[PDB]
Amino acid sequence: QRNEEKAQREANKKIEKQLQKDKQVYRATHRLLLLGAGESGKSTIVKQMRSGIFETKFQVDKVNFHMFDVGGQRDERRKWIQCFNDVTAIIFVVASSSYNMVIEDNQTNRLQEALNLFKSIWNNRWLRTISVILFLNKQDLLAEKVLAGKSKIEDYFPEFARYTTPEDATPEPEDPRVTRAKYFIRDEFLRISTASGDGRHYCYPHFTCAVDTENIRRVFNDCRDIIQRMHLRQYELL
Amino acid sequence: QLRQEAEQLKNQIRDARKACADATLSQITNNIDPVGRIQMRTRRTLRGHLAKIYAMHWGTDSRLLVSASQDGKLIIWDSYTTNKVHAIPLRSSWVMTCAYAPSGNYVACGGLDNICSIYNLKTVRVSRELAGHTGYLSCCRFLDDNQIVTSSGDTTCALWDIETGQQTTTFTGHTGDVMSLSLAPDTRLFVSGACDASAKLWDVREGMCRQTFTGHESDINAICFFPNGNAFATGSDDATCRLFDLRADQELMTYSHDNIICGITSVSFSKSGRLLLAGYDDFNCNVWDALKADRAGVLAGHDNRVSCLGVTDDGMAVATGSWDSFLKIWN
Amino acid sequence: QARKLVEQLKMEANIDRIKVSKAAADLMAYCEAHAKEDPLLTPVPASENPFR
Amino acid sequence: EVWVVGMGIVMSLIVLAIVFGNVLVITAIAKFERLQTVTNYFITSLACADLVMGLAVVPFGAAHILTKTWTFGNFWCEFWTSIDVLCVTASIETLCVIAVDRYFAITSPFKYQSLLTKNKARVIILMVWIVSGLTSFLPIQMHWYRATHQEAINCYAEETCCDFFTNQAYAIASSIVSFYVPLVIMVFVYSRVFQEAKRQLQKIDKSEGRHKALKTLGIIMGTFTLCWLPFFIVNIVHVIQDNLIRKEVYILLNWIGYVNSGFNPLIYCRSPDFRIAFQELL
Ligand SMILES: CN[C@@H]1CCc2c(ccc(O)c2O)[C@H]1O
């Protein structure tokens, strides 16, 4: 019986060595979750940045980022959202040009549905410490719709009527109206984000576009900021 | 339209169930002596999982168990000697369940990939990749070495044949996505609990849900037959565990404590059926006295939330695997 | 869709049910009869326990 | 009598507090599996150094100062001096290592997880303890630190009294290695960490526009500096010129430096996880 025990111990040692070798790789790799409204052009971001699940691995600055995206689970209830607890960040994709597109029908707005989804993600008992990277696609489409008449933000969003452009705003090298609309949408997302939790996790709103291809650098910088803030708060400096 | 007829049938069912009820289980089991306090200490702690653990399954011999984690390693343990017999890399990192075949030759696991993977231990390599579920599958169990039942997020349970790789039959008509599943000791029947707070009983051969139990208020995360096979206990996010009886067609007792409000993740029964062990979200799995619904003991070894809780077939030990990647053997 | 639901409920209607007292007595009798052969219920002797 | 007894009470309280805090933090780290981490391994090394200090050199030093003589053997007073140097050097260098670990964690986030491992933590702790042990025992035990003037020779030949007399070279080297290099390293890494913290705070203020780091780094630097800097300045000064520095001031500043061992667990073990672990322990 001693020979069997010795062989089993040798097998255990081999499995433990393999487990350590895999642990090095697992700790090296950072995981991201891609969650979007569905019609917000998440695929266009995937093409530029890079079964129900779709996993792509992109590395930048010798850092391995592994992105997970799920589209098969279209149910409103999200019981798989609780598994992405160790992910570095949740990439949120929202089409800011979908305010006018009302909805199946009877939905208030696609942007309103995205706001509700973002609120549900933020106010989750499990994703309390998971930060969200927010991408607003179709900035060109939003500009085309806003500059064109007969489609006003205030018609669908009454809060836009009593709104002014932020003083501490950085316009791109834009019209006043499109800038006001973009910053109103960003402020809506930020007011949804900041109120629930403080310090545990932050929202990073980026005004990306289909033509833009620097989203990988933005995601890298956002992940670096997220880990720095996590480490700073763990040591009680931030 | 037909909704009025459905409501009338539901009212008739409720009236029949109320008329069948004469006395509660408490009124009968209050006379018998209580179980008393029970203290359980972690005999062995199993170490080596990189990430959080979702599901485990004790072997038939009670010597071995298989554990699933998000790092992709499907580790098979020797619970007596605390040794890793095998470690199986997985195609998808995200896994929600695992199973151990009664013969011990096969091990099945699945996750968010919507695919049930079956691995042959003695030949490790993937024997068959089962596809046909549109939603994520949450639990897998083995009837025999050839038939496997998977519970998916498609709100439909399916029975597969490993040799042909196609579903022999499917179980439909259940509103929410199912997360828990338990087979009968005779393997003729099984149950599933979904997010619609209703746990249904199916017949594997017939393929129809004979009875439906809707006592819970929130999504059902756990389910498990009584060892007799005539009863089963369900755990939900409503912080309540309820014991349902098939012949009585309703719940007998509810296991709730006012101090704790965290939901139940996994439940299991002792060999005699007297003790109902239910994990909780508060990092503590509790031990209930099934007959009197009085909590006997609490296990506090784990740090993170428990996700799986099983009892050996011989009844010697209870294994709980939590999100801190540590699986503890209790006795 | 509703036809399937009403048919299923009609099928569930005609099921014989035993009084809750009888079922509770059966579960209690099972628990009493199998109480002895339970390692969890009765603390296992140290020599008998495989783990320790 | 009362004045002598009054000192006895304060040294008894000091040694009791140091031992209690160090054993409590070591027990908290060892008991629970969640608390073991590379940084917590460094905390364990610091706690072990401070516990050895409190068990060995604080009570013997108190007995020496109260009884005004060394009843024990000459080899034993040399051993006491070696253990004192070892404890001080190990504690300060472990503090420096903790500061370096925090600086690497904040400055290089992606590489920090792969840079520091359990094995690397073990080898760093072993190297720190090895260099501390060298600096302590190798000069003292090999008798390279004894002074040349007859005042030290009379004290070292006699058995009743055994005080500290040191060379210029050994005192300078010991002070440098024990305090000044760790001081420079800690100051630099904490300045960089403060800059990164204020940068992150500025970024947080930039978006969603419509202190704590300063206080934390202030207490961390202030405790260590106020405890050790005067004593090492005196170490340099009494060697440079012997007249001004009296023995009483030297011993007083040495004990003020000793109290840093007791103060350390309050600073480095003040986390909610540690507080929960302490509540579980007692
Ligand atoms: C007897 N007291 C000793 C003597 C000299 C000395 C101390 C501490 C750290 C050092 O680097 C030293 O050189 C003191 O604790």
PDB file of C-alpha atoms in Angstrom, chain B residues 115-326:
ATOM      1  CA  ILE B 115     -22.042  23.375 -23.799  1.00  0.00           C
ATOM      2  CA  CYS B 116     -21.956  20.362 -21.478  1.00  0.00           C
ATOM      3  CA  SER B 117     -18.494  18.775 -21.554  1.00  0.00           C
ATOM      4  CA  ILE B 118     -18.034  15.156 -20.455  1.00  0.00           C
ATOM      5  CA  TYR B 119     -14.549  13.918 -19.562  1.00  0.00           C
ATOM      6  CA  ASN B 120     -13.428  10.283 -19.434  1.00  0.00           C
ATOM      7  CA  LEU B 121     -11.149   9.717 -16.445  1.00  0.00           C
ATOM      8  CA  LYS B 122     -10.124   6.146 -17.327  1.00  0.00           C
ATOM      9  CA  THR B 123      -8.936   5.733 -20.912  1.00  0.00           C
ATOM     10  CA  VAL B 124      -7.959  12.545 -19.401  1.00  0.00           C
ATOM     11  CA  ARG B 125      -9.709  13.683 -22.577  1.00  0.00           C
ATOM     12  CA  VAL B 126     -13.095  15.186 -23.402  1.00  0.00           C
ATOM     13  CA  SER B 127     -15.309  12.250 -24.367  1.00  0.00           C
ATOM     14  CA  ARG B 128     -18.218  14.287 -25.744  1.00  0.00           C
ATOM     15  CA  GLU B 129     -19.167  17.951 -26.125  1.00  0.00           C
ATOM     16  CA  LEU B 130     -22.934  18.280 -25.710  1.00  0.00           C
ATOM     17  CA  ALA B 131     -24.530  21.208 -27.548  1.00  0.00           C
ATOM     18  CA  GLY B 132     -28.126  22.302 -27.970  1.00  0.00           C
ATOM     19  CA  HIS B 133     -28.734  24.664 -25.051  1.00  0.00           C
ATOM     20  CA  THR B 134     -29.272  28.312 -25.968  1.00  0.00           C
ATOM     21  CA  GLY B 135     -28.710  29.505 -22.395  1.00  0.00           C
ATOM     22  CA  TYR B 136     -26.018  28.762 -19.824  1.00  0.00           C
ATOM     23  CA  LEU B 137     -26.397  25.411 -18.072  1.00  0.00           C
ATOM     24  CA  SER B 138     -26.389  25.469 -14.274  1.00  0.00           C
ATOM     25  CA  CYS B 139     -26.408  21.823 -13.149  1.00  0.00           C
ATOM     26  CA  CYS B 140     -25.561  18.387 -14.530  1.00  0.00           C
ATOM     27  CA  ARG B 141     -26.411  14.966 -13.116  1.00  0.00           C
ATOM     28  CA  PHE B 142     -25.969  11.369 -14.269  1.00  0.00           C
ATOM     29  CA  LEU B 143     -28.761   8.811 -14.422  1.00  0.00           C
ATOM     30  CA  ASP B 144     -26.454   6.033 -15.636  1.00  0.00           C
ATOM     31  CA  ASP B 145     -23.051   6.029 -17.315  1.00  0.00           C
ATOM     32  CA  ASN B 146     -24.785   6.896 -20.615  1.00  0.00           C
ATOM     33  CA  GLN B 147     -27.646   9.283 -19.725  1.00  0.00           C
ATOM     34  CA  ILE B 148     -27.009  12.798 -18.394  1.00  0.00           C
ATOM     35  CA  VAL B 149     -29.550  15.483 -17.446  1.00  0.00           C
ATOM     36  CA  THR B 150     -28.558  19.144 -17.779  1.00  0.00           C
ATOM     37  CA  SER B 151     -30.412  22.188 -16.445  1.00  0.00           C
ATOM     38  CA  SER B 152     -29.900  25.329 -18.514  1.00  0.00           C
ATOM     39  CA  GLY B 153     -30.756  29.017 -18.679  1.00  0.00           C
ATOM     40  CA  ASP B 154     -32.942  28.292 -21.706  1.00  0.00           C
ATOM     41  CA  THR B 155     -35.626  27.683 -19.013  1.00  0.00           C
ATOM     42  CA  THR B 156     -35.694  24.065 -20.262  1.00  0.00           C
ATOM     43  CA  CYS B 157     -34.171  20.936 -18.747  1.00  0.00           C
ATOM     44  CA  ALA B 158     -32.866  18.333 -21.184  1.00  0.00           C
ATOM     45  CA  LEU B 159     -31.924  14.657 -21.027  1.00  0.00           C
ATOM     46  CA  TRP B 160     -28.980  13.638 -23.208  1.00  0.00           C
ATOM     47  CA  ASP B 161     -27.496  10.409 -24.517  1.00  0.00           C
ATOM     48  CA  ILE B 162     -23.698  10.500 -24.470  1.00  0.00           C
ATOM     49  CA  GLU B 163     -23.197   7.960 -27.268  1.00  0.00           C
ATOM     50  CA  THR B 164     -25.358   9.770 -29.826  1.00  0.00           C
ATOM     51  CA  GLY B 165     -24.730  13.237 -28.376  1.00  0.00           C
ATOM     52  CA  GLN B 166     -28.310  14.423 -28.962  1.00  0.00           C
ATOM     53  CA  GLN B 167     -31.084  15.123 -26.472  1.00  0.00           C
ATOM     54  CA  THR B 168     -33.410  12.152 -26.083  1.00  0.00           C
ATOM     55  CA  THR B 169     -36.116  14.389 -24.598  1.00  0.00           C
ATOM     56  CA  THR B 170     -36.542  17.966 -23.409  1.00  0.00           C
ATOM     57  CA  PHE B 171     -38.494  19.383 -20.468  1.00  0.00           C
ATOM     58  CA  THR B 172     -40.327  22.611 -21.327  1.00  0.00           C
ATOM     59  CA  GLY B 173     -43.087  24.726 -19.823  1.00  0.00           C
ATOM     60  CA  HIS B 174     -41.045  26.277 -17.000  1.00  0.00           C
ATOM     61  CA  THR B 175     -41.040  30.064 -17.004  1.00  0.00           C
ATOM     62  CA  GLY B 176     -37.683  31.047 -15.506  1.00  0.00           C
ATOM     63  CA  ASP B 177     -34.130  29.898 -16.066  1.00  0.00           C
ATOM     64  CA  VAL B 178     -33.410  26.902 -13.854  1.00  0.00           C
ATOM     65  CA  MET B 179     -30.369  26.811 -11.598  1.00  0.00           C
ATOM     66  CA  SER B 180     -30.743  23.671  -9.463  1.00  0.00           C
ATOM     67  CA  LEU B 181     -31.495  20.022 -10.171  1.00  0.00           C
ATOM     68  CA  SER B 182     -31.630  16.798  -8.151  1.00  0.00           C
ATOM     69  CA  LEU B 183     -32.163  13.194  -9.222  1.00  0.00           C
ATOM     70  CA  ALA B 184     -34.167  10.542  -7.418  1.00  0.00           C
ATOM     71  CA  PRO B 185     -32.491   7.667  -5.553  1.00  0.00           C
ATOM     72  CA  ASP B 186     -34.317   5.409  -8.021  1.00  0.00           C
ATOM     73  CA  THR B 187     -33.422   7.936 -10.800  1.00  0.00           C
ATOM     74  CA  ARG B 188     -36.989   7.740 -12.169  1.00  0.00           C
ATOM     75  CA  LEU B 189     -37.833  11.331 -11.180  1.00  0.00           C
ATOM     76  CA  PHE B 190     -36.074  14.673 -10.833  1.00  0.00           C
ATOM     77  CA  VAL B 191     -36.832  18.306 -10.017  1.00  0.00           C
ATOM     78  CA  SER B 192     -35.622  21.754 -11.066  1.00  0.00           C
ATOM     79  CA  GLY B 193     -35.946  25.197  -9.482  1.00  0.00           C
ATOM     80  CA  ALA B 194     -35.816  28.411 -11.497  1.00  0.00           C
ATOM     81  CA  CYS B 195     -35.968  32.168 -11.028  1.00  0.00           C
ATOM     82  CA  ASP B 196     -39.784  32.110 -11.209  1.00  0.00           C
ATOM     83  CA  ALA B 197     -39.811  30.865  -7.570  1.00  0.00           C
ATOM     84  CA  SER B 198     -41.489  27.616  -8.696  1.00  0.00           C
ATOM     85  CA  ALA B 199     -39.886  24.188  -8.332  1.00  0.00           C
ATOM     86  CA  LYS B 200     -41.347  21.514 -10.605  1.00  0.00           C
ATOM     87  CA  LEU B 201     -41.144  17.721 -10.512  1.00  0.00           C
ATOM     88  CA  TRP B 202     -40.508  15.919 -13.798  1.00  0.00           C
ATOM     89  CA  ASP B 203     -40.687  12.299 -14.912  1.00  0.00           C
ATOM     90  CA  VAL B 204     -37.646  11.306 -16.965  1.00  0.00           C
ATOM     91  CA  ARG B 205     -39.387   8.559 -18.939  1.00  0.00           C
ATOM     92  CA  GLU B 206     -42.630  10.436 -19.612  1.00  0.00           C
ATOM     93  CA  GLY B 207     -41.074  13.881 -20.008  1.00  0.00           C
ATOM     94  CA  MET B 208     -43.885  15.844 -18.339  1.00  0.00           C
ATOM     95  CA  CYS B 209     -43.938  17.882 -15.131  1.00  0.00           C
ATOM     96  CA  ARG B 210     -46.300  16.057 -12.778  1.00  0.00           C
ATOM     97  CA  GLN B 211     -46.396  18.642  -9.974  1.00  0.00           C
ATOM     98  CA  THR B 212     -45.412  22.282  -9.491  1.00  0.00           C
ATOM     99  CA  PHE B 213     -44.520  23.894  -6.156  1.00  0.00           C
ATOM    100  CA  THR B 214     -44.521  27.699  -5.956  1.00  0.00           C
ATOM    101  CA  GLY B 215     -44.099  28.416  -2.248  1.00  0.00           C
ATOM    102  CA  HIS B 216     -41.005  30.596  -2.565  1.00  0.00           C
ATOM    103  CA  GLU B 217     -40.955  34.341  -3.198  1.00  0.00           C
ATOM    104  CA  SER B 218     -37.554  34.790  -4.890  1.00  0.00           C
ATOM    105  CA  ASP B 219     -35.381  32.823  -7.298  1.00  0.00           C
ATOM    106  CA  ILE B 220     -34.614  29.254  -6.228  1.00  0.00           C
ATOM    107  CA  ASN B 221     -30.872  28.563  -6.144  1.00  0.00           C
ATOM    108  CA  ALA B 222     -30.772  25.116  -4.500  1.00  0.00           C
ATOM    109  CA  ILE B 223     -32.816  21.914  -4.460  1.00  0.00           C
ATOM    110  CA  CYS B 224     -32.298  18.425  -3.046  1.00  0.00           C
ATOM    111  CA  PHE B 225     -34.425  15.347  -2.389  1.00  0.00           C
ATOM    112  CA  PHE B 226     -34.996  13.867   1.015  1.00  0.00           C
ATOM    113  CA  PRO B 227     -33.175  10.507   1.239  1.00  0.00           C
ATOM    114  CA  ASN B 228     -36.540   8.722   1.139  1.00  0.00           C
ATOM    115  CA  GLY B 229     -37.236  10.332  -2.239  1.00  0.00           C
ATOM    116  CA  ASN B 230     -40.738  11.465  -1.233  1.00  0.00           C
ATOM    117  CA  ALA B 231     -39.665  15.003  -0.275  1.00  0.00           C
ATOM    118  CA  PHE B 232     -37.278  17.753  -1.326  1.00  0.00           C
ATOM    119  CA  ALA B 233     -36.020  21.000   0.199  1.00  0.00           C
ATOM    120  CA  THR B 234     -35.461  24.196  -1.779  1.00  0.00           C
ATOM    121  CA  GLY B 235     -33.308  27.220  -1.006  1.00  0.00           C
ATOM    122  CA  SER B 236     -33.960  30.655  -2.476  1.00  0.00           C
ATOM    123  CA  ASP B 237     -32.784  34.254  -2.202  1.00  0.00           C
ATOM    124  CA  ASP B 238     -35.714  34.982   0.136  1.00  0.00           C
ATOM    125  CA  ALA B 239     -33.491  33.643   2.963  1.00  0.00           C
ATOM    126  CA  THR B 240     -35.948  30.758   3.390  1.00  0.00           C
ATOM    127  CA  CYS B 241     -35.602  26.990   3.025  1.00  0.00           C
ATOM    128  CA  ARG B 242     -38.820  25.029   2.527  1.00  0.00           C
ATOM    129  CA  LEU B 243     -39.451  21.280   2.673  1.00  0.00           C
ATOM    130  CA  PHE B 244     -41.884  20.135  -0.020  1.00  0.00           C
ATOM    131  CA  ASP B 245     -43.663  16.774  -0.027  1.00  0.00           C
ATOM    132  CA  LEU B 246     -44.602  15.037  -3.268  1.00  0.00           C
ATOM    133  CA  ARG B 247     -47.524  12.983  -1.950  1.00  0.00           C
ATOM    134  CA  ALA B 248     -48.954  15.930  -0.002  1.00  0.00           C
ATOM    135  CA  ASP B 249     -48.204  18.169  -3.029  1.00  0.00           C
ATOM    136  CA  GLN B 250     -47.293  21.177  -0.850  1.00  0.00           C
ATOM    137  CA  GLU B 251     -44.686  22.481   1.581  1.00  0.00           C
ATOM    138  CA  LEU B 252     -44.563  21.105   5.122  1.00  0.00           C
ATOM    139  CA  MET B 253     -42.162  23.468   6.911  1.00  0.00           C
ATOM    140  CA  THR B 254     -40.144  26.610   6.231  1.00  0.00           C
ATOM    141  CA  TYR B 255     -36.631  27.082   7.633  1.00  0.00           C
ATOM    142  CA  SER B 256     -36.076  30.783   8.311  1.00  0.00           C
ATOM    143  CA  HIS B 257     -34.264  32.834  10.945  1.00  0.00           C
ATOM    144  CA  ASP B 258     -35.186  36.462  11.581  1.00  0.00           C
ATOM    145  CA  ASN B 259     -31.574  37.407  12.350  1.00  0.00           C
ATOM    146  CA  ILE B 260     -30.273  36.360   8.911  1.00  0.00           C
ATOM    147  CA  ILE B 261     -31.592  37.691   5.599  1.00  0.00           C
ATOM    148  CA  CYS B 262     -28.936  36.420   3.174  1.00  0.00           C
ATOM    149  CA  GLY B 263     -30.063  34.047   0.451  1.00  0.00           C
ATOM    150  CA  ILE B 264     -29.299  30.339   0.300  1.00  0.00           C
ATOM    151  CA  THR B 265     -26.856  29.148  -2.364  1.00  0.00           C
ATOM    152  CA  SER B 266     -26.822  25.363  -1.845  1.00  0.00           C
ATOM    153  CA  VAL B 267     -28.704  22.830   0.281  1.00  0.00           C
ATOM    154  CA  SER B 268     -28.183  19.180   1.156  1.00  0.00           C
ATOM    155  CA  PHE B 269     -29.620  16.497   3.420  1.00  0.00           C
ATOM    156  CA  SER B 270     -28.034  14.172   5.938  1.00  0.00           C
ATOM    157  CA  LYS B 271     -28.132  10.436   5.280  1.00  0.00           C
ATOM    158  CA  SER B 272     -31.005   9.909   7.726  1.00  0.00           C
ATOM    159  CA  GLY B 273     -32.729  13.077   6.507  1.00  0.00           C
ATOM    160  CA  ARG B 274     -32.932  14.574  10.001  1.00  0.00           C
ATOM    161  CA  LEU B 275     -30.406  17.338   9.252  1.00  0.00           C
ATOM    162  CA  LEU B 276     -30.906  19.775   6.371  1.00  0.00           C
ATOM    163  CA  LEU B 277     -27.640  21.623   5.727  1.00  0.00           C
ATOM    164  CA  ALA B 278     -28.039  24.863   3.770  1.00  0.00           C
ATOM    165  CA  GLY B 279     -25.297  27.254   2.750  1.00  0.00           C
ATOM    166  CA  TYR B 280     -25.824  30.994   2.984  1.00  0.00           C
ATOM    167  CA  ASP B 281     -24.496  34.216   1.485  1.00  0.00           C
ATOM    168  CA  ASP B 282     -23.208  35.431   4.883  1.00  0.00           C
ATOM    169  CA  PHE B 283     -20.130  33.132   4.635  1.00  0.00           C
ATOM    170  CA  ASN B 284     -21.790  30.733   7.123  1.00  0.00           C
ATOM    171  CA  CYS B 285     -23.577  27.493   6.270  1.00  0.00           C
ATOM    172  CA  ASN B 286     -26.215  26.502   8.816  1.00  0.00           C
ATOM    173  CA  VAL B 287     -27.484  23.115   9.991  1.00  0.00           C
ATOM    174  CA  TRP B 288     -31.238  22.752  10.485  1.00  0.00           C
ATOM    175  CA  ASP B 289     -33.304  20.112  12.254  1.00  0.00           C
ATOM    176  CA  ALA B 290     -35.661  19.084   9.462  1.00  0.00           C
ATOM    177  CA  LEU B 291     -38.455  17.736  11.665  1.00  0.00           C
ATOM    178  CA  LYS B 292     -38.652  20.693  14.075  1.00  0.00           C
ATOM    179  CA  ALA B 293     -37.161  23.545  11.974  1.00  0.00           C
ATOM    180  CA  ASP B 294     -34.846  24.514  14.845  1.00  0.00           C
ATOM    181  CA  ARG B 295     -31.279  25.400  13.899  1.00  0.00           C
ATOM    182  CA  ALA B 296     -28.769  23.038  15.517  1.00  0.00           C
ATOM    183  CA  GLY B 297     -25.317  24.324  14.556  1.00  0.00           C
ATOM    184  CA  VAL B 298     -23.410  26.739  12.347  1.00  0.00           C
ATOM    185  CA  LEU B 299     -20.161  26.260  10.415  1.00  0.00           C
ATOM    186  CA  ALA B 300     -17.894  29.320  10.293  1.00  0.00           C
ATOM    187  CA  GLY B 301     -14.687  28.045   8.684  1.00  0.00           C
ATOM    188  CA  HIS B 302     -15.110  29.763   5.326  1.00  0.00           C
ATOM    189  CA  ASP B 303     -14.139  33.350   4.522  1.00  0.00           C
ATOM    190  CA  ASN B 304     -16.011  34.060   1.272  1.00  0.00           C
ATOM    191  CA  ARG B 305     -19.483  33.056   0.130  1.00  0.00           C
ATOM    192  CA  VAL B 306     -20.232  29.336  -0.094  1.00  0.00           C
ATOM    193  CA  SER B 307     -21.495  28.031  -3.431  1.00  0.00           C
ATOM    194  CA  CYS B 308     -21.618  24.230  -3.092  1.00  0.00           C
ATOM    195  CA  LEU B 309     -22.485  21.907  -0.213  1.00  0.00           C
ATOM    196  CA  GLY B 310     -22.594  18.125  -0.444  1.00  0.00           C
ATOM    197  CA  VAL B 311     -22.921  15.119   1.843  1.00  0.00           C
ATOM    198  CA  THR B 312     -21.141  11.816   1.269  1.00  0.00           C
ATOM    199  CA  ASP B 313     -23.225   8.801   0.294  1.00  0.00           C
ATOM    200  CA  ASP B 314     -22.018   6.985   3.414  1.00  0.00           C
ATOM    201  CA  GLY B 315     -22.899  10.138   5.365  1.00  0.00           C
ATOM    202  CA  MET B 316     -19.469  10.488   6.975  1.00  0.00           C
ATOM    203  CA  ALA B 317     -18.525  14.018   5.902  1.00  0.00           C
ATOM    204  CA  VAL B 318     -19.888  17.263   4.471  1.00  0.00           C
ATOM    205  CA  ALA B 319     -17.836  19.242   1.951  1.00  0.00           C
ATOM    206  CA  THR B 320     -18.440  22.961   1.425  1.00  0.00           C
ATOM    207  CA  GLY B 321     -16.716  24.952  -1.316  1.00  0.00           C
ATOM    208  CA  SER B 322     -16.794  28.736  -1.148  1.00  0.00           C
ATOM    209  CA  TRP B 323     -15.604  31.683  -3.226  1.00  0.00           C
ATOM    210  CA  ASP B 324     -12.280  31.954  -1.368  1.00  0.00           C
ATOM    211  CA  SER B 325     -11.021  28.980  -3.455  1.00  0.00           C
ATOM    212  CA  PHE B 326     -10.859  26.832  -0.293  1.00  0.00           C
TER     213      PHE B 326
END
